[PDB]
Amino acid sequence: PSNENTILSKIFYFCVLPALSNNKACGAGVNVKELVLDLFYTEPFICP
Amino acid sequence: KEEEKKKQQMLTGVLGLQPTMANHPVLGVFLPKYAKQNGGNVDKTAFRLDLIRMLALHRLN
Amino acid sequence: TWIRHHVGIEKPNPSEGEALNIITFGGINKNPPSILLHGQQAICEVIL
Amino acid sequence: IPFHRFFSDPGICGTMNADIQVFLNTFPHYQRNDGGFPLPPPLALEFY
Amino acid sequence: SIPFAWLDRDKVQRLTNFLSNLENLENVDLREHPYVTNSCVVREGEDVDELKTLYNTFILWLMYHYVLSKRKPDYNAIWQDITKLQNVVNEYLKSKGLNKGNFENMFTNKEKFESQFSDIHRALLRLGNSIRWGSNVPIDTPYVNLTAEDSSEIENNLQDAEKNMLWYTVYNINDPWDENGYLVTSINKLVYLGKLFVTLNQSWSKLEKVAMSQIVTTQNHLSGHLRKNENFNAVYSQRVLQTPLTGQRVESFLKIITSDYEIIKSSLE
Known part of the structure; x- marks a missing residue:
């Protein structure tokens, strides 16, 4: 991150999202492993 | 000879891929490198994701 | 040092040894205002 | 080429050159x- | 195991000899001596070695920067001795010692720029002090003022530090002969150790920027040659050799290109 980029990132998440959203956001996590091994690793992708 | 059995065992462990897919170039090049691993405790899922991203890198039209 | 400069006080050090010990026994600024037109003044401070 | 009072944007200059970029990242108040x-x-x- | 290109059995030994005993020869600048870079050639004109010498010099600069970052000793010892002299002797003389100056000027002239000083005027102030303690007025030879029997040896020591910053020695301020006592020996030690510290760090940053510039230079040539063909081993060698590099990336990248050596060797035509 450039100095501009980090400052703008803090500005965005701490100001722009809660003011415009009125605190209607939520944090989110992901198993990318089980995500891609469910969606992908199927026949059109695997078969040559 | 034991090395070929290790290669084939890892091939069936990755996905149960068919030999038809074992002949694929991305497989043909990486199965030997996956042979010199997976004897460790590493994972089975890591190899699936690795094959996914490598097969993807291969197919950039 | 930055706070002393920016509030605009010299004599950079308090000289925290014997000098301060002397000062508790009692000490004036020793530099009077060279001009004075209206006599005495002092204003204390309550934060609110 | 930062040469004038105007026409010397550091956020522009430090992206073309990495030498200004490590200079501003050590002294951020010149950005x-x-x-x-x-x-x-x-x-x-x-x-002059 | 010590990876190199389509390269013979004598030049491998000469390269590994140079990169092992990098610390002992003087003038460590790989740019300045051409006996190694011209030696790491594939041979047979231009056609059978252009891309291959490009890869081989890539490995050469990369492992030169690796053995630099692995073999440079700690200079914070000599800055620790600078802080010991500068803090303990001269401040106690200026304040506790008496008839010197005032708190704000001297103590902050020493205290200021703990991190990353290249300042010559502060040095000049201490040299003016010790010269005022000494015999004469001008500032001709200030580092071991009042005696020129060691000036050539200490300039030789600083030039040898510029040549080989990896193997450095600190000469000494001799005990039995001195213009003044503990103060002027502390000042001469302080100024010589400050010049040594800034000399070592500037020479090191010079060589590190040189090595990074050469590696980033050769990557673009290597990518421009390797971009054209469309084989899978070709494009994998393209991506491995187009990974971005920094000085703290080079060690892990050497360990990566060690395992990826067996595929890019076949990927080269």
């Missing part, structure tokens, strides 16, 4: 567009 962050000392002749 300001407002005053004069230091030009090359043969160029920074303010009273």
Whole structure:
């Protein structure tokens, strides 16, 4: 991150999202492993 | 000879891929490198994701 | 040092040894205002 | 080429050159567009 | 195991000899001596070695920067001795010692720029002090003022530090002969150790920027040659050799190109 980029990132998440959203956001996590091994690793992708 | 059995065992462990897919170039090049691993405790899922991203890198039209 | 400069006080050090010990026994600024037109003044401070 | 009072944006200059970028990342208060962050000392002749 | 290109059995030994005993020869600048870079050639004109010498010099600069970052000793010892002299002797003389100056000027002239000083005027102030303690007025030879029997040896020591910053020695301020006492020996030690510290760090940053510039230079040539062909081993060698590099990336990248050596060797035509 450039100095501009980090400052703008803090500005965005701490100001722009809660003011415009009125605190209607939520944090989110992901198993990318089980995500891609469910969606992908199927026949059109695997078969040559 | 034991090395070929290790290669084939890892091939069936990755996905149960068919030999038809074992002949694929991305497989043909990486199965030997996956042979010199997976004897460790590493994972089975890591190899699936690795094959996914490598097969993807291969197919950039 | 930055706070002393920016509030605009010299004599950079308090000289925290014997000098301060002397000062508790009692000490004036020793530099009077060279001009004075209206006599005495002092204003204390309550934060609110 | 930062040479003038104007026409010397540090956020522009430090992206073309990595030398300014490690310079601003050690001294962040020169990233300001407002005053004069230091030009090359043969160029920074303010009273002239 | 010590990876190199389509390269013979004598030049491998000469390269590994140079990169092992990098610390002992003087003038460590790989740019300045051409006996190694011209030696790491594939041979047979231009056609059978252009891309291959490009890869081989890539490995050469990369492992040169690796053995630099692995073999440079700690200079914070000599800055620790600078802080010991500068803090303990001269401040106690200026304040506790008496008839010197005031708190704000001297103590902050020493205290200021703990991190990353290249300042010569502060040095000049201490040299003016010790010269005022000494015999004469001008500032001709200030580092071991009042005696020129060691000036050539200490300039030789600083030039040898510029040549080989990896193997450095600190000469000494001799005990039995001195213009003044503990103060002027502390000042001469302080100024010589400050010059040594800034000399070592500037020479090191010079060589590190040189090595990074050469590696980033050769990557673009290597990518421009390797971009054209469309084989899978070709494009994998393209991606491995187009990974971005920094000085703290080079060690892990050497360990990566060690395992990826067996595929890019076949990927080269």
